[PDB]
């Protein structure tokens, strides 16, 4: 509903992939765990917690899914490329 | 009472042999001399010479 406030610049690089209207960026396990922490108390990962210790990778992903309909974001725990609607929920594979 | 005493722990009084007691010391022994280590060069296998 709302817009995540803009945290200055230095946005992590998102690789354009017009081959399938997709995009690739390496986030890491800390973000994929943090966002997994985000969607467990009813909270939001698209725009909530603007003063986060790891807000930057969260803010870019939100714009990236708007720019690209089938984003391809890869973690490091297993290195899987979860897609845009696979990134929609915030629950990746397992765990509470 | 030959409470021999002790220095004031003041650097000068430790060096001087000054003590608060009846016996005045000779000198603050010696333990050797600590020199600054000489640094090592990089030589010139990285650049020409051409004397």
């Amino acid at each position: 509903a709302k817009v995540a406030p803009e945290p200055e610049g230095e946005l992590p690089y998102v690789h354009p992939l017009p081959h399938r209207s997709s995009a690739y960026i390496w986030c890491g396990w800390w973000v994929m765990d943090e966002i997994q922490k985000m969607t467990e108390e009813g909270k939001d990962w698209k725009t909530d917690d603007p003063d986060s210790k790891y807000y930057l990778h969260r803010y870019t992903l939100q714009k990236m899914m708007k720019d690209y309909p089938e984003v391809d974001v890869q973690e490091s725990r297993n290195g899987y490329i979860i897609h845009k609607t696979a990134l929609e929920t915030g629950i990746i594979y397992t765990y509470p | 009472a030959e409470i021999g005493g002790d220095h004031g722990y003041n650097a000068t009084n430790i060096a001087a042999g000054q003590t608060s007691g009846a016996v005045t010391q000779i000198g603050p022994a010696v333990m050797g001399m600590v020199r600054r280590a000489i640094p090592n060069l990089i030589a010139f296998d990285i650049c020409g010479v051409q004397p």
Partner: protein, 405 residues
């Protein structure tokens, strides 16, 4: 010590005709590089200093002195202004380093022209061109011994009851206890100094820019460099140890860190990771004595550091320190003079016995310990540790707290 109050001299080479002068710069220095134009063109012209909001002409050479890394001469590649918002000296250093990385200022060293060189000190009727002489200083630090003592004060009735019921001598044991505690206490003092005089690790050059400035945490991905699972996380601690030891080598100017004092948790982490260069591994503790009962010395870490267990550690830490082969190249001197002198007596009013012990050891610091001071003051200094000269200044030790084990 063979007599109390040991002393130790220290020779420093400093340049400028004046071995003893306010602000003379030490020639050879573990941290501070040489004034590479001191003997060269600096013996011909004096270069304007770099200061806050100093507008830069192009082509001129300006001196500077970072708090670390010593003198440096920077030529200017683009005219800039130094942003006097960095008024503080450390902020001035940050600004100048930023400019240097940007390429605006780049260091240079040069010699002097022959037409200038051949005339030095008024040959051919010139004047005001003296040579850039050097000299040496020699100062000394002195170390006086303190004392430490205890009493037992038992009663003969206790001795008879103890020898009768349990067979314990009831005197030797007390003496034992006494001596034990005293020696134990002495040991603790030494260790505390090592922690007390330790520099703050994980900070300055050892500081990963994303870390917490002095504490290594196993939950921060910046510290563990993105490792997952224990088999890879612990090797990050190994790398942290390496960084601290290397920085010791830099500041000390004698050698890399060669011993480590750490709590049970850190030592057990070390003993359960494949210390050598390998892929990833973690398991039972085999390489080290992790229990503080057989011994405190737990082992040798990779053949480089001797690892000791501080069984009384308050929270969690490791401290990397250097101790050279020579006895003087030490950092801290524990110099016993009289060892555990015993004394016995009794109270004349009731014949009941008293047992006691006393020793005199004293303890001193290595000169050059601060490793950021070209020349000491008063030339006769107190070698005994204090707050003015040891608290977080002795470069021979670096301390880091470990959280998340």
């Amino acid at each position: 010590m063979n007599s109390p109050t040991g002393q130790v001299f220290a020779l420093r080479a400093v340049y400028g005709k004046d071995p003893v002068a306010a602000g003379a710069k030490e020639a050879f220095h573990p941290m501070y590089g040489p004034d590479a134009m001191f003997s060269g063109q600096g013996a011909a012209k004096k270069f304007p200093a770099l200061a806050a909001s100093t507008q830069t002409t192009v082509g001129d050479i300006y001196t500077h002195f970072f708090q670390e890394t010593g003198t440096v001469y920077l030529q200017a590649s683009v005219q800039v202004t130094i942003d006097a918002g960095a008024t503080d000296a450390a902020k001035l250093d940050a600004e100048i380093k930023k400019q240097m990385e940007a390429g605006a200022l780049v260091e240079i060293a040069e010699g002097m022209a022959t037409s200038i060189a051949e005339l030095q000190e008024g040959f051919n009727g010139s004047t005001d061109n003296p040579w850039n002489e050097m000299g040496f200083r020699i100062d000394k630090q002195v170390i006086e011994a303190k004392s430490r003592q205890l009493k037992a004060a038992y009663s003969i009735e206790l001795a008879q009851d103890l020898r009768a019921v349990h067979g314990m001598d009831a005197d030797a044991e007390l003496s034992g206890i006494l001596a034990t505690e005293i020696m134990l206490e002495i040991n603790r003092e030494v260790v505390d100094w090592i922690n007390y005089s330790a520099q703050v690790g994980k900070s300055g050059m050892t500081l990963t820019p994303g870390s917490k400035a002095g504490v290594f945490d196993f939950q921060d991905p910046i510290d563990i460099r993105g490792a997952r699972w224990a088999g890879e996380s612990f090797k990050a601690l190994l790398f942290q140890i390496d960084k601290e030891a290397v920085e010791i080598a830099r500041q000390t100017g004698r050698g890399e860190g060669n011993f480590i004092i750490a709590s049970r948790n850190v030592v057990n982490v070390l003993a359960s990771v494949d210390t050598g260069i390998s892929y990833a591994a973690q398991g039972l503790a085999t390489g080290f004595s992790t229990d503080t009962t057989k011994s405190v010395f737990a082992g040798v870490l990779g053949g480089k550091y001797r690892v000791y267990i501080d069984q009384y550690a308050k929270q969690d830490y490791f401290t990397v320190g250097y101790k050279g082969p020579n006895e003087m190249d030490a950092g801290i001197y524990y110099a016993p003079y009289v060892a555990l002198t015993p004394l016995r007596g009794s109270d004349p009013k009731n014949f009941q016995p008293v047992m006691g012990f006393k020793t005199r050891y004293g303890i001193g610091i290595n000169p050059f310990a601060e490793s950021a001071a070209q020349a000491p003051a008063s030339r006769i200094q107190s070698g005994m540790p204090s707050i003015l000269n040891s608290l977080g200044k002795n470069a021979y030790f670096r301390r880091v707290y470990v959280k998340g084990i």
